[PDB]
Design a protein around this ligand. Sequence first.
Ligand SMILES: [Zn+2]
Lengths: 56, 206, 69, 145, 141, 63, 53, 56, 63, 143, 101
Amino acid sequence: ALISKKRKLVADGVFYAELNEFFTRELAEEGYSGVEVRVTPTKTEVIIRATRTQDV
Amino acid sequence: FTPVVLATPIPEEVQQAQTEIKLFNKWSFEEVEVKDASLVDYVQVRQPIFVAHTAGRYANKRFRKAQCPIIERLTNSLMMNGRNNGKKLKAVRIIKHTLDIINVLTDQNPIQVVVDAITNTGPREDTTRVGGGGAARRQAVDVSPLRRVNQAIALLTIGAREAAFRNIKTIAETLAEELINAAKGSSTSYAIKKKDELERVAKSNR
Amino acid sequence: QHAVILDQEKYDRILKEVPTYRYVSVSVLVDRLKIGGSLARIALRHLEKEGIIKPISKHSKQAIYTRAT
Amino acid sequence: SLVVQEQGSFQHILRLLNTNVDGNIKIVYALTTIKGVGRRYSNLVCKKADVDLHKRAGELTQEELERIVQIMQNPTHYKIPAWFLNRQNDITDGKDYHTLANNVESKLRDDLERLKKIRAHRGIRHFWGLRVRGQHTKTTGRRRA
Amino acid sequence: AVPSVQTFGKKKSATAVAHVKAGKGLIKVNGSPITLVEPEILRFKVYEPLLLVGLDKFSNIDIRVRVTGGGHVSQVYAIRQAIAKGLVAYHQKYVDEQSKNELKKAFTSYDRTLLIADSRRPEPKKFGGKGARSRFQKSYR
Amino acid sequence: GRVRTKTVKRASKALIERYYPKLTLDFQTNKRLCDEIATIQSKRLRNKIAGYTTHLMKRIQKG
Amino acid sequence: ENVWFSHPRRYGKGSRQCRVCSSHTGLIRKYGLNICRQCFREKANDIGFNKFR
Amino acid sequence: IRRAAYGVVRYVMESGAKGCEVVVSGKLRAARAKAMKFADGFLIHSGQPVNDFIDT
Amino acid sequence: TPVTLAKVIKVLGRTGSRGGVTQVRVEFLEDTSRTIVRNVKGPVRENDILVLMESEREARRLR
Amino acid sequence: PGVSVRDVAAQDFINAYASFLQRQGKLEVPGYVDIVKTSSGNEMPPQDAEGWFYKRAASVARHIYMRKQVGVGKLNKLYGGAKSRGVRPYKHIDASGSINRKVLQALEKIGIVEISPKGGRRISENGQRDLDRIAAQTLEEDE
Amino acid sequence: IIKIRITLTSTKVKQLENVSSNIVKNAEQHNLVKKGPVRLPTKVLKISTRKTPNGEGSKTWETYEMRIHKRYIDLEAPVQIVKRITQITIEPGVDVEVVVA
RNA sequence: UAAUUGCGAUAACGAACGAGACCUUAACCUACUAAAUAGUGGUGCUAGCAUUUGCUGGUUAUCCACUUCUUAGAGGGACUAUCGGUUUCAAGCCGAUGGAAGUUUGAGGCAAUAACAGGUCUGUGAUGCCCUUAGACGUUCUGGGCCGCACGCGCGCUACACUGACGGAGCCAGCGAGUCUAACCUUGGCCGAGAGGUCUUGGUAAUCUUGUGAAACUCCGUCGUGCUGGGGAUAGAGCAUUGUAAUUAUUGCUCUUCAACGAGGAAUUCCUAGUAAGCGCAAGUCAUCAGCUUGCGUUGAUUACGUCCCUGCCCUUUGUACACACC
Ligand SMILES: [Zn+2]
């Protein structure tokens, strides 16, 4: 808590990047296309667009 | 002149010169006129000014410089020898002192004195290197009034500068003596020496 | 070399020769005479004192004077 | 206007403490000709000596001259702070000196021979004539002299 | 209520702001008069707008000014433009088109930016060189 | 060079070839006509078209 | 459990170094990174930044 | 490599792309490297519309 | 000295391999029929005067 | 009719007030005034060791007339300037702090000035009046 | 009734803008005060790097960017539309915050 | 044309990439929406002079109004608009008008096909192959070095001084950054000559640091052309902090020592307007140090508006014993 907005948003970007590389490295078999982040108060949602859900 | 007094008190000497005629600091541009032909349109005095500061855009066009006041061009030429770039204000003060001095000795219109100095320093023939397989000789050619005048100003300021440098005399004093010995064809000035040298060289190369 | 003090003959010379000029200043003194330079400043003060010369302008770098009248 | 015509009371180029000082010059920078003194130290000592420094240096009769000598050689005694001194908390006397025109070099030589005797690396850079403090040697100092 | 006017002048990064009101005819800036703006030469550059029009036109209007930013000379240019703006702005509003146009013509026959700001601006540094146009040296060998 | 390129020449040509009984010689109303009539993604280029069309109708009025 | 390898050290190059490569040649500490640029600009929009001029 | 690239490109231009491109760089069947280049339809490389329309 | 002035009628071009030269036609300012070619150094337009020492030379193309 | 200091030029008002402060003579100058170089980045102490203090204080009070509140860190930034680092490039350096401190002190002693809440110091109504009077002096020096 | 402060921050100006607009819309759909959005000076985060890993080549530099915008709104209302308007307006790429008074 | 930009011409026709277009940035907007983290103005309350009502001030919200300055959303605004002259009288160019703006408006960004054995395994947990791998090339901890000095070269900093050094005072910018599970920016107060110390305070920021009162620059005055007081190297003494740390001096403060250098030979780089040049400021490295770099703004020019003569580039043509391509 109590963090500047600049450093917060840079951290958001780094969070996005780390998740993206992570799902790239993990979900190769499953046809991973991309991600989306939706920050809310209480239940922050992460959508994952990939080919197969049977496997994901 | 019939003054107009006002809340800000504003001295009368200043209202006086203002609403009487639109002079330089103390110096009129009436009765001054170019002595020499070829040398109107290039040396331009018929608008007046107050002091020779102006941020104008003269380098854009080929010749809008020539519509610039010659004094502004002179000030602009002093700010060089790079310890004095951006020191056009210092130059204006130096020029102020110089006109005071050229009035002190030469009561005449010192603007006109300057005009005569320029027109007497303007080399009316100048050299160029022909291509010339071998020695690539020099060829005598004429020189436009504008380049003539520019080199004139340059020569005057450079002579004054090289005098004033390792010497106690101030840039205004050197400039004053240079303009004086140039307004007359005294042949004591750096400028007139160079004029004679170049012109005589041209005579040799024709 | 120039001179950095008076011998009273320079004192006479100044009052005798400077009114010859319609143009007077520091280096004018330092050339026509041989003066320590700072003393040309003091002398131009001494002729600002009374109407031996008439300053039409001055400055800290430079000073401008003339004939008495 | 300080226009004064004084004739013979002036005395041009003169000498003090085995070192010559022009009389024809402003006194503060005049004394700078001495060694172990800077412009502002010369300012300070004359400031303590109650002198009019608009003068040139041929003025200031022997009384004022010797007074300045005293204020100089006895610095702390005339309210000189320790921190304006060339040699502070010396070495073995541990005191604060303004060693001067010849003793300056005497004492420099003393310190030099001291650490060259004890054979410190600083003394050995002094020994072989190298750039003492830790700048690089490769590219500078040439045209050795 | 006080049939006044507000304008502004500008330069590279100096900006002048002025308020021109029906008044006794004072002329001041930053709590100080025009008479004491002391770079000590360009006092005349700020005089100029008073004088292309003449001085009777100001006895009827008090004039307050301030500036901010730029440099010592940029501020002078900002003010000497803002002034001629404020006056002719007053005359747009409170006197006739013909007088206003006479004012403008008096200025413009003489113009030194005077009411049209100098649109020259600084350029950015392009890398590998200390300036936009300037560059460092090379050796070639 | 203050040249106009082929896209502009072509579009202006087609505009005048099928809207000749509009398209006055005034840049501004022709500009509004362009904004009303065409599927265009840049104001700058739109001005280019308007100016050129005007020049075109002008020399057409000259025959 | 011995003192005196970091005998002298605490400022100067070497307590500021790259996650990627421990590089300290002219790092960038803006916004908490300390990435040597050799790494970083390959990480360039791997931050999520973009350039427009 | 040919079959793979042309099948992908075929699938894309079937999916409805305006154009595609496949560059394969390195050592393919030998030591000296060679960049093979496969493509279809259309592409631009310089405006901001690159940043708008194409995904790389 | 028999100095002459000459008012420019027409520029002919910029000779000289490097282009510091400018050729020109000029009327001798005393004789309307005296139109003469000559070389010049600096910036020039028409409606301007040059000063001549030699009123005879009439140089030609150069390099 | 009605006078302020901003209607006076800076240097001449300052100098008039500086000289006035000595004709008064009651200013409480310290003893180390004669030695300190006025900054670690000046090249020399004041050429006029006599009244540089009074010039400084007269400048200070003028500063405080026009500013709401001002403080020591600001004064040192102000009266300090470019340094002479010799061989490596110059840069701006703040002036000495003890100087401005003692100036503030002996000025609030006179009550021209006072501590300002919100920080620093500010003129008193007393000094306000006095300095309007001195501005009137500087104006009426024109006979 | 409460006297609330709100702030919006984002890079996606179109998202933040229409979010602000819908906020103001729902607000003045049942008039609250007005407190229009206060477009603050936008913030750019500037990088300066060399385009080139190991520095063979021309000294090619590159400045990356993160163009950030911010703006705030005040309002006044009781319990319900406070919590309704806090949550009902939400968007990815757009960060939000509320303060009591 | 700046352009394979067009005019057109035409065994070519019709298409595509590139350039352009595009996006960014900076310049115009009294037109809109707003604003105690931007501003005003009045209103209260209040200081000072004058008092004749006024001028300068203060007062975080006394309240009110406004948005011109400020900021930022959408929009407008230039298209070479108008006139004139040019030209196959086409594409286009020149001049003038007006315009915030008339060089592609400026400066950028982006950037084709083909190729280099250009650089990089010392960016990568990208990586083939080889080598090693326990007395290891891994890892850790002891110091040192990378800085070692006859010399050569490169980028650069400071000077050679009067267009200057120095002492006072004036005081004017902007790009930016900034403390959480911590110790940034630090104001302000006190002490200290200074460097620094010390007690508090604002700030996760248009709120506080900060108007970052920067520099030069300006005005007054000391200086007097004397390697001079220019110059401040080198070298010495001590004080500060920085820091488990300072010797191989960290840096800075105090004092002393005052080198060389009088515009720099042959040779050679950069640049055409807010440009060069000077000027300093921030950021970058920063738990210290920039003489480095990226950006910023302040002051602010001379000269040209052309040529291919050098150095090379572009297109055509031509010649050729070259194709590792005139090295
Ligand atoms: Zn790294």
